[PDB]
């Protein structure tokens, strides 16, 4: 993968996300998934564009297309691109909630593009993982922690106005940010994320948002702490992971899980054949958790792809995915424009 923030890492990041979405799609909303099944099914990749992407990729592409068009974050442009993408291709797997947001954004009378998201859930906003599932491009465009946080938040808030939603997007963007920096201990990676989340969850609004939902005072911080405990635990089963971290559509029940998958799979697992590389292993492992496989795998894939780089993206897998060339072009353009 080479240096921090290399072309290879950019390409690997978006390819990894695409793979997770396309391959994870087959198992979406499966309560349980058998590992042998995933393996058998990834054999079906080996020897074009046979696997459709979902809303995860559709929104990721629109986000990145906005950043490229403006060479900056522009809420009006990005909001419009999200809404127009839905309009043109509505059957990509959007929830009814975010569709309500899109319909409001499509009204040419809508001046304030943040207001639709805020009206959701009786004015409290969605805590879904939709803000995070598309956020990797933010970490490609912006190098500083400060900017990653600011624009992961803003991009997320166009559809997910609950701090439980947009803080999940920040966490995912931070994970990609770190992975683009290259080789790290799992301990150092986790500690860096924990520090950032502890700082964010100090905010008074974040504290109130959690309290309303009966959650721990610092939800993501507490979940990252659990990840540290899990990584030290003997004979952790896929069920115990799901049990402690979740595999759901809430950002809190999917973003930490995706990060755990990345961290866990830094090391060889005897349960996944050693022939699979580290990226492949991460994707296989994350999909085998079940639940929202598509988003958990797209997020784990973004992190892993940034970390391992394009050399770990198997051409046979990549070429099975709808739009892999467009995805690759977007990654190279992000590098040219923002990491020249
Ligand atoms: C923030 C929130 N809900 N957000 C949400 N997003 C989702 O995707 C799904 C669900 C169920 N709920 C909230 C709503 C009411 C109160 N009383 C307190 C908080
Ligand atoms: Mg999807």
Alpha-carbon distance 25 to 27, whole Å? 5
Name the residue among 138, 77, 128, 60 with its Cα closest to residue 100.
128
List the structure tokens of 177: 């940010």
Q: What angle do CA 19, 21, 23 make, to 5 degrees?
A: 60
Instruction: List, in sequence order, every residue forming a beta bridge with 321; answer none if it has no partner.
Output: 51
Among 126, 251, 292, residue to substitute to test ligand 1 (most atoms within 8 Å of Cβ): 126
Burial of 38-69, coded b for 16+ CB within 10 Å and e otherwise, reads beeebeebeeeeebebbbbbbbbbbbbbbbbe
Structural method: X-ray
- Furthest-apart CA pair in the chain: how many Å? 57
For tokens 């896929």, the residue is 238
- Ligand 2: distance of its center to the CA of 27 in Å? 11
DSSP line for 12-30: HHHHHHHHHHHHHGGGTTB
**Angstrom distance (rounded) from CA 260 to CA 286:** 9
Q: Which ligand is nearest to the CA of 55?
A: 2
What domains lie within the chain, and their CATH numbers?
7-51+130-140+163-338 (1.10.4080.10)
Distance CA 326, CA 113 (A): 27
Q: Which ligand is nearest to the CA of 248?
A: 1
Sign of CA dihedral 280, 267, 143, 223: positive
Identify which of 231, 232, 210 has the alpha carbon closest to the alpha carbon of residue 219. Answer: 210
The conformation of residue 4, written as its DSSP 8-state character, comes to T
- How many Cβ atoms from other residues are within 10 Å of residue 7's Cβ? 18
Q: Is the CB of 213 under 6 A from ligand 1?
A: yes
What secondary structure letter does DSSP report for 252? Answer: G
φ and ψ at residue 231, rounded to 5 degrees: -70, -20
Q: How far is CA 106 from the centre of its chain?
A: 25
250: which strand partners?
128
């Amino acid at each position: 993968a080479g240096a921090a923030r290399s072309l290879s890492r950019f390409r690997g990041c978006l390819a990894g996300a695409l793979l997770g979405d396309c391959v994870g799609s087959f198992y979406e909303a499966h309560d349980t998934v058998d590992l042998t099944s995933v393996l058998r099914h990834v054999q079906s990749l080996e020897p074009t564009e046979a696997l459709y992407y979902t809303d995860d990729t559709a929104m990721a592409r629109a986000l990145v297309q906005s950043l490229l068009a403006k060479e900056a974050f522009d809420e009006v442009d990005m909001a419009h691109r999200f809404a127009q993408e839905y309009k043109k291709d509505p059957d990509r797997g959007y929830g009814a909630g975010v569709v309500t947001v899109f319909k409001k954004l499509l009204n040419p009378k809508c001046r304030d593009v943040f207001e639709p998201a805020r009206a959701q859930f009786n004015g409290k906003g969605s805590y879904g993982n939709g803000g995070a599932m598309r956020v990797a491009g933010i970490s490609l465009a912006y190098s500083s922690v400060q900017d990653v946080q600011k624009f992961a938040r803003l991009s997320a808030q166009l559809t997910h106005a609950s701090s439980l939603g947009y803080n999940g997007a920040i966490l995912q963007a931070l994970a990609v940010h770190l992975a683009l920096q290259g080789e790290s201990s799992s301990e150092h990676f986790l500690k860096q994320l924990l520090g950032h989340m502890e700082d964010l969850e100090g905010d008074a609004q974040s504290v109130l948002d959690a309290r309303e939902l009966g959650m721990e005072e610092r939800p993501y911080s507490s979940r990252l702490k659990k990840i540290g405990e899990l990584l030290d635990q003997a004979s952790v089963t896929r069920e115990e992971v799901v049990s402690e971290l979740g595999n759901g559509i809430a950002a809190f029940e999917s973003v930490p899980t995706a990060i755990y998958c990345f961290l866990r799979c830094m090391e060889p697992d005897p349960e996944i054949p050693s022939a699979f590389n580290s990226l492949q292993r991460t994707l296989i492992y994350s999909i085998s958790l079940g639940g929202d496989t598509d988003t958990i795998a797209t997020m784990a894939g973004a992190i892993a792809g940034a970390y391992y780089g394009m050399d770990q993206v198997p051409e046979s897998w990549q070429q099975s995915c709808e739009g892999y060339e467009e995805t690759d072009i977007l990654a190279q353009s992000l590098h040219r424009v923002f990491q020249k």
